[PDB]
């Protein structure tokens, strides 16, 4: 009865846990992820925020923008930077820093990121996969360009698995056999 999303006004079942909904930390009601205009990636990131960051429904939101929104936006950018920073500061990625938007090197991903061009985890991952994959395709008969390539790759996949557990770098369309 009282089980209806305030935004779309439609009913929801107390038992369908396959639904993508958030619970307001104030009144405990549920709201559809899609009704707050959130992509599945956003929903996953939210399901990852600290227990300290509660989702809050519109009417329970006192000051706008709702804090969960700014926190969400910051979380994605900070997490992306967290990963890139590690890639940049590694001794195994030195050869992918500079080529010698579709960035052909890490310094390029770096600029594309600082300018706020990444709005999803998928685009960021794909740009990096392409760079790593390009290096793998051209590291003919040579290690540390073959060896390093695989440890920046393993490094990338693992680093991403840590920050974005719900995301699959392995499935990227840009990997080659």
């Amino acid at each position: 009865s009282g089980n209806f999303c305030p935004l779309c006004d439609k009913c929801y079942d107390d038992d369908d846990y396959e639904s993508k909904m958030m619970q307001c930390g104030k009144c405990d009601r549920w709201v559809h992820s899609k009704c707050e205009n959130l992509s599945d990636e956003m929903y996953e990131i939210l399901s990852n925020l600290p227990e300290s960051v509660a989702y809050t429904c519109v009417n329970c939101t006192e000051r706008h923008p709702a804090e969960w929104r700014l926190a969400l936006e910051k979380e994605l950018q900070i997490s992306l930077k967290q990963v890139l920073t590690a890639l940049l500061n590694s001794r195994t990625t030195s050869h992918l820093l500079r080529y010698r938007q579709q960035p052909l090197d890490l310094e390029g991903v770096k600029r594309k990121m600082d300018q706020g061009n990444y709005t999803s985890v998928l685009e960021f991952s794909d740009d990096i996969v392409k760079i790593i994959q390009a290096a793998i395709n051209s590291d003919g008969g040579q290690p540390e360009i073959k060896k390093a390539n695989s440890m920046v790759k393993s490094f990338f996949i693992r680093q991403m698995e840590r920050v974005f557990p719900w995301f699959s770098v392995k499935k990227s369309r840009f990997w080659e056999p």
Partner: peptide
């Protein structure tokens, strides 16, 4: 943030 997933 609590979700159906968490």
């Amino acid at each position: 943030a609590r979700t159906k997933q968490t």
